[PDB]
Amino acid sequence: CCGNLMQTLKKDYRLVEYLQAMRNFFLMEGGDTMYDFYTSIFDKIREKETWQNVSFLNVQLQEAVGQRYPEDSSRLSISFENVDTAKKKLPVHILDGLTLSYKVPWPVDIVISLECQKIYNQVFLLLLQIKWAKYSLDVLLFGELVSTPVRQQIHRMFLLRVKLMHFVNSLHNYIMTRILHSTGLEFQHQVEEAKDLDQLIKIHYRYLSTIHDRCLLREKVSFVKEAIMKVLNLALMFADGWQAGLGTWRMESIEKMESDFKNCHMFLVTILNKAVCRGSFPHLESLALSLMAGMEQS
């Protein structure tokens, strides 16, 4: 009976297709379309255009999805709430008002619960913030800095930007590949092994719990989450200075930003060391090692 039920669920309710769509949208598996999307979003933020318009954001999202995934374009919906930038000082946190929704049919909506949908949306929001920071660092054009006369200071600021970009990219790659990609492969394998609907529900819940743990959402990592937020805020300030260019970023300000980055890196390393010695996040040691990987010991 359970085999017949699982076969019916797989064939008629496209459960695997729904999970693939979740990967495309929540996990940004549609990397080309989501890349163009997040690049347009970061450009709108850089252009100081109104991005906090749910209608504008939803129109751009529907156009992006309809270009590459027209069938999925009708089930995905995005809403945008204006994030109070005064409270959320990190430019990545401007996106915290975005709410992505995916139309899950019955009876699959029993599997993709509102709490499941909330977790997926939280993961999507985290990925969007990471993509926003990534684009902000990648889109930093050297020509924006070329206007300032201090060639040596400009070069030092560019090298500090390069180092910060390498660090942030390393963190992003850790999350995407070592956390997100590995957990996606594990989830796909577990879903392939799912024998019954209750087993499938448990597998999905385990996947979600693993993401939530790796997303530092547990209270036990609240101090770690805050430290990560501090480092992300430093990265956002660096991206803002890069967008302002060296003409606005004076050598004193570039040196100050480099000092703040180094201090944040030292603090993060100390926090990671304390956590590893506490044994609470041994998997983060590889992430901690990766974040200290290739960073010069200042």
Partner: protein, 449 residues
């Protein structure tokens, strides 16, 4: 949407490289020589609009521009089976067909003569490009046609797209062969001038180094120019696999290159490819691990650049990006990076943080991969200055003898003086010194007056 890329093929060598690139891309994507998708190309996951345009409902045309000052190569390309692959409106051929006479200045003047036609082609391709990032120039620096046309293309791309990035596939002259073109170092100098002033990134492809790599890695005793072009086309295919197979990383050019280019002047990139196999050695599927892959990539026999052994300068890698394509275990990637760091397999700049970035990518589904895992290495290594220093030494050796300069003196750019060559030599000297400095902690003050 894809970021469309216009490919600029300059001179005889550049046009041959472009033709072989388009052939390889067509084969990998299942595109017919007429631009029609082969029935086997069922994986609609590739972004053709990045590199190809549709000429009709069935024909995909490469976003490639073939520019030559000599008609022989363009006519040979147009007489090949791949004549229908490229959009004909993006092909500018010099009416005089005489080439540049191995004079960079003559090639530049020919580009100026075809400036209107070339920029009309470029604009037509830009309107045919949904999200044109910039232009990719394929040319040789040693000849007249590929070098001068490359300088012209760089100038016109800088003029038309001054806010857009310009990447080039620049074939550097063979440094181990005695060039019969005594003014080749002058031509090379003019090309380096244009790359410094009007290009944003110049990938130096030394035909001597290409032959050496073919010998050591491909087991090709005498690499032909066609074989070098096929190797370059394979490299381009591997670099575009992430465009044809979208994935977790390197989904955009700016995201890919941001980590590699710390300063605007430090735009000289070294490349690496994996797996490197001889055509005969496809047979044995070695269970290579990500660590094993990285180890094989680290062999100088597999590096497509022959940097000299400088004994005085502790040349080091400024930055490394490893793009890995195929079946990759993330834990294996992590262990590979760990082993690379632990083994100190790469020397980094002493003046800043530097590492080997590793990207794992899916392979293109339309191109059958003989390897479970494939990889591209992008690296910034200070030993590339030894190539630049060698080019500078060759320029100084030719300029000091005024050898074969009369062919350049026929062209207005070099008719009265060689000041463009001397400025190119000075810029290349400063670049070499900075690259040597960039291997040193004093790189913080490198390039300061």
């Amino acid at each position: 949407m894809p970021r469309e890329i216009i490919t600029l093929q300059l001179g005889q060598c550049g046009n041959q490289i472009g033709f072989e690139f388009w052939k390889q891309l067509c084969a990998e994507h299942g595109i017919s020589p007429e631009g029609i998708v082969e029935e086997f190309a069922t994986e609609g996951t590739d972004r053709k609009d990045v590199f190809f345009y549709q000429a009709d409902d069935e024909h995909y045309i490469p976003r490639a521009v073939l520019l030559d000052l000599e008609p022989r190569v363009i006519h040979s390309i147009l007489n090949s089976p791949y004549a229908k692959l490229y959009n004909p409106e993006n092909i500018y051929l010099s009416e005089h067909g005489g080439g540049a006479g191995n004079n960079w200045a003559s090639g530049f003047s020919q580009g100026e003569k075809i400036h209107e036609d070339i920029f009309d082609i470029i604009d037509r391709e830009a309107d045919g490009s949904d999200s044109l990032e910039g232009f990719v120039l394929c040319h040789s620096i040693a000849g007249g046609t590929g070098s001068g046309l490359g300088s012209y293309l760089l100038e016109r791309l800088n003029d038309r797209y001054p806010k857009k990035l310009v990447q080039t596939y620049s074939v550097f002259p063979n440094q181990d062969e005695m060039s019969d073109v005594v003014v080749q170092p002058y031509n090379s100098l003019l090309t380096l001038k244009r790359l410094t002033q009007n290009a944003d990134c110049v990938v130096v492809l030394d035909n001597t180094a290409l032959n050496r790599i073919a010998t050591d890695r491909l087991h090709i005793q005498n690499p032909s120019f066609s074989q070098i072009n096929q190797l370059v086309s394979t490299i381009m295919s591997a670099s575009t696999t992430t465009l044809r197979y979208p994935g977790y990383m390197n989904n955009d050019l700016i995201g890919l290159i941001a980590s590699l280019i710390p300063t605007p002047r430090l735009h000289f990139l070294m490349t690496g490819y994996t797996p490197l196999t001889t055509d005969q050695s496809v047979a044995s599927v070695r269970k290579t691990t990500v660590l094993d892959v990285m180890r094989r990539l680290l062999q100088p026999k597999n590096v497509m650049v022959s940097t000299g052994r400088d004994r005085q300068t502790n040349h080091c890698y400024i930055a490394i990006l490893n793009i890995i394509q195929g079946e990759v275990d993330p834990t294996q990637v992590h262990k590979s990076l760990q082993r690379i760091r632990e083994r100190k397999l790469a020397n980094f700049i002493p003046w800043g943080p530097a590492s080997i970035q590793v990207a794992l990518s899916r392979k293109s589904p339309y191109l059958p991969s003989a390897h479970r895992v494939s990889g591209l290495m992008m690296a910034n290594h200070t030993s590339i200055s030894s190539l630049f220093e060698r080019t500078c030494r060759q320029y100084d050796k030719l300029r000091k003898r005024e050898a074969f300069l009369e062919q350049f003196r026929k062209e207005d750019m070099f008719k009265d003086n060689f000041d463009e060559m001397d400025t190119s030599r000075e810029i290349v000297q400063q670049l070499i010194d900075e690259y040597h400095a960039a291997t040193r902690p004093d790189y913080i003050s490198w390039g300061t007056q």
